[model samples]
Target: GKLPPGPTPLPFIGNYLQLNTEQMYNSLMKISERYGPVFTIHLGPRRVVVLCGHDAVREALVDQAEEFSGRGEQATFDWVFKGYGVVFSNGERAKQLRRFSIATLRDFGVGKRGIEERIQEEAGFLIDALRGTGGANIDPTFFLSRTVSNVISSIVFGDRFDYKDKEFLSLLRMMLGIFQFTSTSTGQLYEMFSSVMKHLPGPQQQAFQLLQGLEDFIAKKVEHNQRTLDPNSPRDFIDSFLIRMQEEEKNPNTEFYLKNLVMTTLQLFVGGTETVSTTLRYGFLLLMKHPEVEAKVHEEIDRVIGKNRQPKFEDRAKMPYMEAVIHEIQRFGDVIPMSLARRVKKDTKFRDFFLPKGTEVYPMLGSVLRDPSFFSNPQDFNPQHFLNEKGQFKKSDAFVPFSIGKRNCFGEGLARMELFLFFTTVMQNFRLKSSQSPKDIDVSPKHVGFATIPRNYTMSFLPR
Candidate 1:
C-alpha cells in the first residue's frame, strides 16, 4: 500500500520550483540518489514514477513488459499528435498501427539493399554540396538536416527533393522550428500548464502553428498519393498505407483510416529525420573537439574502405575504431536523455513499491547511459567504452541510445546504417577543422531541455 517516497509537492505547482526543468535528467538523478532508484515526483498535477539505473529500468521495461507497455500521454504530445499516431497512442490502435508501419517500412526496403543504395546516393549528393563550401567556415545544420530528411522523404513520398527546392526548404525549417521549441524550457512549462497556456498567446502558439504547417504539408502529400495509388505496384509508404486502407475500408473499427495514416506518416517523417541528423551533427562537433578520435576514424576508413570508394554498410564490420567512435558519440551526445514517458497498464507491485494503474513512468535512459557500473569513464567522451583491450568493437547492454523493450526506436536498423555510411563517407572526403583551438571547441549541448542539441559552431571541411 506504500508509494515510493519523493520530495513533497505543494498544492498547485508540484515540484515545479523544486526541480530544474532545463537539466531535468541531472535533477532527476540527484533525486534518485535519495529515493533509491524508483520514486514518484509530481510534474504540475501529474504524478510521474521515475525509474533509475539498469536493474530497475530493465526489470520494469523488459522483465515485466506487459504491465508497463502502454505509451504515456503528455500535454505537449497530446496537443501535437492528439493520440492518433504510434508515438502517443495506447491500446489496440497503437499496436495495429505499429505493426502496419513496421511491415510497410520493411516492404519499402528499410534494412535491405534498396535503402542502402539510396543512402549512398544521398551521401554522394551531400559530399558534392560540402565540396562546394570551398573549405570555408560554414554551419552544417540545414545541410545535414536536408540530407537526412530526403532519406525519409524518398521512403514516404517515393522521391527526394533538390537541396535548393524552396518548398522542401520550407518544410525542413518548419519541422526544425517545432523540434527546437519542444526542446526548450518554455516548451516544458507549456507542457506542464498546457490548459492555461493554450488560452494565452506565446511561443507555444508559434510552435503549434509550425506543427499545423507540417500537418498540412503531409495532408497534401497524402491527397496526392490517394489519386496515384496503384494496388498492384505500391510505390512508397503512402501508397502501401492507402492499399491497407482499401482492404480495411468496410470495417468501421479498423485503425487504417485517413487520420491514422497521416499521423503515422508524420511520426515517421519527424522521428526518422531528427534523431540521426542531430547525432551526426553532434558527432562532427565531438570530432572537432577531439581530433585524435577523428584521426583514428580516418585511419580506419582509409584501411577498410579506401579513398576511392564510398563506404558501404557491409564495411562496418572491418572498422572497429569507427564503430566505437560512433557509439561514444551517441553516448556522450545523450540525445533524448529522458526517453518518451511510458505508463503502467495495470495495478502492480514493482520491486518494493506499489504502482497503480495509469501511473506515468520516466525510464531515465541517461541513468543507464551514464551508469558507472557499465561504463569505466561515464562522464568523459571515451571510445574505449565500446572497444576492448584487443582493439575489437565491444557491445554493451547499457549503450542504449535507442532505448530498450517494445517501445525502442522502430528505425534502429536504418539509423545505424545511415550513421556508419554517412559518417565514414564524409570523413573519407574531408577532414574537419575548427577555427578556434580544440580547447575552445565545446562539445556540450547548446540546449539541455528535451534533446541534448549540440551548440552551433563553424568548421572548415578541408579536402583529404
Candidate 2:
C-alpha cells in the first residue's frame, strides 16, 4: 500500500495546487486516463485514492464493504457538521446513528405518503410562486431549494415557512453561501487548515462564522423544543428524539441527545435541499439545451398525468420517457462528482493493488457515470441510457449519483421522490424554455465548495 499511480507532487502542498474545484473532477478524469481506473493523489496533506470505473468501484465499495466503511466523506463535512451527523461519523457509533436516522425517517414516512404529502404541498406552493413570476425569467434555484428544504423543516421542526419570511430567507441565503464557499479552493484549504485559517480574514473566515451561527440557530431550536415538547405525542424529529431520550435515559450510550438531534436535523436540511433542487435546475437547463428531449418529457408527462391534474408518484410508472429524462438529468449534471473518501477498514485487494487498513479510498462516481465503457456516449445528454428498446424505464447499476455501499447516500430514497415529483410537477404546469440559443446553455458547472451547481441562467415558463 505504498501510493497509487499519480503525478509527482511537492511536499506539504501535495496535489492541492492541481485540485481546484472548477477542474477537480476533470483533473481526476485526466489522471484516470494516465493511471487506469484506480489511482491516488494528494489534496493538501490528505492522501486520496480515486476509483474510476464501475468495476474498480464495485471491487472496493461493494465487494469489500468493510474495507471501505472507515473511509467516507469527512473533510468539508467535518467542518460543516463538526462531527455531529450520520454522514461524517465512523465505526459503531456511525452505524448506530445511521440506523437510527433511517428508522426515524421511515417512521416519519420517508418512502411513503407522509413525506410525499409534504413535498406535494411545497410543490404546489412552488408552482404558485413560479406562476407569480408571470412567465418572467427568474432564478428558480431558491424557490425549488426552499420547497425541498421546507419538507425537511416540516418534518424536523413541525412547521414550514413562507418564502417571503425574512428569517427563513436568511437561513436559505446562509445555506447557499455555505455551498458556494465550500466549492472553492479557499473553502477546501479552510477545512484542511481550519486551525490556521481562523486567524485570517476572508470569505472562508466569514463562512466559518456563518456556520457557527447556523449551529447556534439549531441549538436554539433544540432548546425551544425541549421546553415545549410533550412526551406522549411526538410531532416531528425533535419531539420524537425528545421522547426517545427520556425512554433511553437508563442507557448511557445512546447518541440521540439534543445535540445529535439538532445537528442531524440540520443534516437533513443541508444534505436534502440544494443538491436535489440544483439538479432539477440543471435538468431543465439541459432540456433547454436540448429542446427535443424537453418536448418529449413534457409530452410524456401530459400523456401520463393529463393537463388538468398535478403529477404524482403513480404517474412515474406510466411516464417512461419522463422518468428516463430525470435519470439522464442526474447523469448529465453529475453534481456530486468526486466520490466521498472511504478508509479501508481492513487490508483488502482491489484489482492488482493492495489497500492496507486505514488507507483512504475514493470512488470517482462522476467518471464512472460518464465512463464510455458503460454509457454509449459518456458526454452526450442522452436519456436512452435509462430506456430500453421498447422505451420502458430501466435502472442501470452504473447510474449511481448517490455513490454506493454501506455509506451510500442516506437521503437517496427521498431525493428520488423529490426529483420525480417536483420535476414532473413543474413539467405538468409549465414548459421550460431558455431565452438563449442552444449553444449558449452552459452545462459547465460553477464549483461551489464541495458541490457543483449550474451557471446562472434564466428559465421562462410557458403555461402548458
Candidate 3:
C-alpha cells in the first residue's frame, strides 16, 4: 500500500478500467497526466511502479542503477523460461549468467570484428534471396528471419542452416507464430492470465506448445553438442556452455546446468532473431513511405561504399545521413518500447515515493523515446532529429531502445552491426517498391505485448 499514488485498484482487476492492457502505454501516459512521472498502477492483481518520461526512468535505471538492476517477472516469460536465463532471472544466478554469457559471447566475436564477418556473410545470402524473387512482391518476414536466424545460428549452433531445411524452417515458423501470438490482444492477456491460461484452449495453449517445442529443439542441440564437444575447441555457444557446466558441476547451486543452457540459448536465438528482423521489416516500411529519405540513403551508400562492394561497419561513420536515418528508425519503430520490467533490489526511496523491495517496475521507454524535450519531433517521423544543421549525425542521449545501465541488451553490438550491414546491403543492391502509394502508407505500429509490431505488407526490390 506504500506504492506511488494513482487510481485506486479494484479487487482483482486492478486498474483494468483505466488501462488498455494491449495499448497500455497510452493509458499509462494518460494516467501520468494526473499522477506525474512517478506513479503506481495496478494491473491484474499486480502493483507496479510506472516510470514515465526520460527523467524519472533515467534517475532510477541510471542514477539508482544497482538498486534498480533486479529483473522483474512477466508471467508469460516465467512459464516459458521458468525464470532462468539472463533476461528474466534475478540476483546472483542472473549475475553469474550475465558474466558467463557476456564473456563467452565475446569470445565468439559478438563484440568484435569476428561476428561482423558472420553477419556480412549472411547478408550475401539475404541479398541473393531478395534478388531471386523475380521482381515479384515478397513477404520479407521469414525471408528476413532465415538470414537473421542464421547469424545467431552460426554463433550459437556453430553453423548456418540451409534456407530450404525443413527442421530449420519449421523452427523459424514456430518462432514467428509465437511472436505473432504475443503481438495479439489475446496474446497480451496470457501474461495476466498465466494463473489459468494454462488450462484454457486458445492461442495461449498454442504458444505454450510452441514454447515447449522450442525448448525441446534446444535440448536436442545441447545434447548434440555434448556428443561431439571437444573441450579444447568449443564450437559455438552450446559447446562453450557445456564446457562451463563441466567446470561448475561440483557446485549444486551453480547456474551452469543444462536447463540454463537451454533457456539461455532460447533467449539468444529468439531474442536475436525477432528483434533486428522486425526492425528491418519496419525500417523497410518507413523507407518505402519516405522515398526521399531512401533516395538520400542510396546516394550516401553509392558515394561512401559504392555498388561494387558490400557495406562495411566502418562505412557508417562516413555516412551521416544513413546513421541518422537508422537511429531514427529505431527511435520511431520502438520495437521493445516497454523496455522489460525491473524490480527494486531493496526498499528504495525514489522522488517522493518509497517502493518496497520486490515491487515490479515498468520503465516505459515509449515515453522516454517519445519524450518531447529530448526528441524535437517526437510525434513526427523525421530523421532530422538525429541530424544537426550541418547535416552530420547527432545522437541524443534519450534514445535508449535497449534501455540503460546494468541491464541493457546483451545482444546490442551484434544487433547494431546486423542492422547496418543488412540494411545498407539491401539498399545498395535494390530499391524497395511498396505495393501501395508512399503518401498513403502509415508507419505506426500497434503494441504487441513488449514489442511494437509493424504492419504486414509485401514489396518488390527493384535492382539498382
- TM-score of each model, in listed order: 0.98, 0.94, 0.98
lDDT score, candidate 2, position 65:
76
Clashing pairs in 3: none
Model 1: residue 412 alpha-carbon error in angstroms:
0.3
Pairs of residues clashing in candidate 1? none
Residue-pair clashes per candidate: 0, 9, 0
TM-score of predicted structure 3: 0.98
Tens digits of per-residue lDDT, candidate 3, 230-266, equal 9989999999989989998899878898888899999
Model 1 per-residue lDDT tens digits across residues 1-464: 88789999997688888787666777788898888899888888888999888888899988888888888856765776899987888999879988888898888779998899999999999999999998889999888988999998899999998999998888888877766776788887765678788878988888888878888889999999888788989999989989989999899999888988888888888888888988999999989889899888888887888889878898988889989998999999888877888998899889878999989998988888889999999988989999999999999988878988877788999998889888999999999988899988887777765677888888888998
lDDT of each: 0.86, 0.78, 0.86
Q: Candidate 2's residue-wise lDDT over 1-464, tens digit each?
A: 45577877778677766665456667777777888778878765666788887888877788877678774544445665766767666776588778878888888878899988888888898889889899998877788888888888887778888788887778877777777777776776664456566677787767766677677788888889889988898888878878887887888887767667777777777777767877887888888899898788877866777887667777788788888888889998886776567888777777667766666777777877887787888889989988889989878888888989878888888998989888889888988878789998888777733667788888778786
The segments of candidate 1 whose C-alpha lies over 4 angstroms from its true place after superposition are: none
Please give the distance, in angstroms, between residue 95's alpha carbon in candidate 1 and its true position after superposition.
Answer: 0.8
Q: Candidate 1, after superposition: displacement of residue 197 in Å? A: 1.4
Cα error of candidate 3 at position 301, Å:
0.8
Range of the 10 consecutive residues with the lowest summed lDDT in candidate 1? 72-81
For every candidate in turn, the CA RMSD to the true structure comes to 1.1, 2.0, 1.3
